[PDB]
Structure formats: structure tokens, C-alpha cells
Amino acid sequence: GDKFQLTFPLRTNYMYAKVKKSLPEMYAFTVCMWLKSSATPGVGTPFSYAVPGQANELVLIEWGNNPMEILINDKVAKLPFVINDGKWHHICVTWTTRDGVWEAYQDGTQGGSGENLAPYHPIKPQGVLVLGQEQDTLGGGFDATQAFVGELAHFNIWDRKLTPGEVYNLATCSTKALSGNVIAWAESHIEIYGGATKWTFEACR
Ligand SMILES: C[As](C)(=O)[O-]
Ligand SMILES: [Ca+2]
Ligand SMILES: [Ca+2]
Secondary structure (H helix, E strand, C coil): CCCEEEEECCCCCCCEEEECCCCCCECEEEEEEEEECCCCCCCEEEEEEEECCEEEEEEEEECCCCCCEEEECCEEEECCCCCCCCCCEEEEEEEECHHHEEEEEECCEEEEEECCCCCCCCECCCCEEEECCCCCECCECCCHHHECCEEEEEEEEECCCCCHHHHHHHHCCCCCCCCCCCECCCHHHEEEECCCEEEECCCCC
């Protein structure tokens, strides 16, 4: 049952979701989600992933008056996304250990790409995946100024790069659209905390 969204209505250090499943060691991956936010200057942290010894193992964050960034092993790449206009947007980032090459997609359109992002470092396994907060400890250490304020749906992770056509299918809600083979969006796949609330969501409607 994937037809739902999570709403994070206020800036707090206590509202979050925990994904029940952890991540394997990933030499490449794609992360995608639908999100909506009117928060400014920055939307905060839609998701973060911490492992022992590195709480910033995989992070998506737009913090204050700074641009939206992906962090891998606490190394930054600035992303092209502009998504805090109060309308729904779909985003994906694909990345590979091979020369640290990444691509960024907004609303089904590839709109940025770069290299030398945490090259040669597979994503480390067995950490804690949180939605709506940035981690400074394993599964915690939240900071309200970094918290996501807005709505999130259809959070998915695959341990490969999706093709541009596969991303297009996600962003247009095609019947061909895939679910994540590592993390897939379902109510029973997450735990919610602190005031985050679940509502029905009909994507592309
Ligand atoms: C300095 As930080 C992004 O780990 O709160
Ligand atoms: Ca952190
Ligand atoms: Ca922090």
C-alpha cells in the first residue's frame, strides 16, 4: 500500500520516520521521492542515513541559506533542484562509486550531473535510515534547524542506476513505474514518530 504521504507540519527535533529496513553495501544507487514544501530559505532534510563512525553516510539536505546538497560519506555535491514552491515535485539522484559520478533529475528531467563525489567508496551497510531529520548520532542527534518541513511520498531506493526512461516513468506515474528493490514505499515499511502524520496520496492527480 503505497498511496500515502507523510506530512511534517512544523520545524522540530522530534518528528521523523524511521525506515524499518537498512541498506546493503551499495556500489551504485538511485534514491527518488515526491516532495512538497513551502519552507524557506531551505526545506531541510528529506532523509539521512547514518552508520557507525559516519552519521552523514548518505544525506539530502537544504539547510538555511545554503543550496540543496547530497552528502555521501560527509562529502558534498550541490544539486540543481528548486522544489520549495509549494507544489509537488519528483526528484531522483543516481550515483556510482565509479569515479563518483552522479546525475540529478527533477520532475522526470535530468538537470544536473557531476563527478568526484565520494569516489571509490561504496555506501556502507547496516545503518539507520531516517526521513525528515538529519542525524548526528546513529539514529538520532536531530537538529530542528535542519528538519524537513513539508510532505513526502514514494520514497524509494534501488542499488543500481535507473535509466532516464525509468525516472520518466516514476515522474509521470506510469503503470510501468518501478518500486525500489532496496527501499520501497509502503506503510508497513516505516515507523512514524513525534507528530509526523500519514495522509492519502494520489500521485500525478
Ligand atoms: C554539520 As551536520 C550537516 O552533520 O549537522
Ligand atoms: Ca550530521
Ligand atoms: Ca546535524
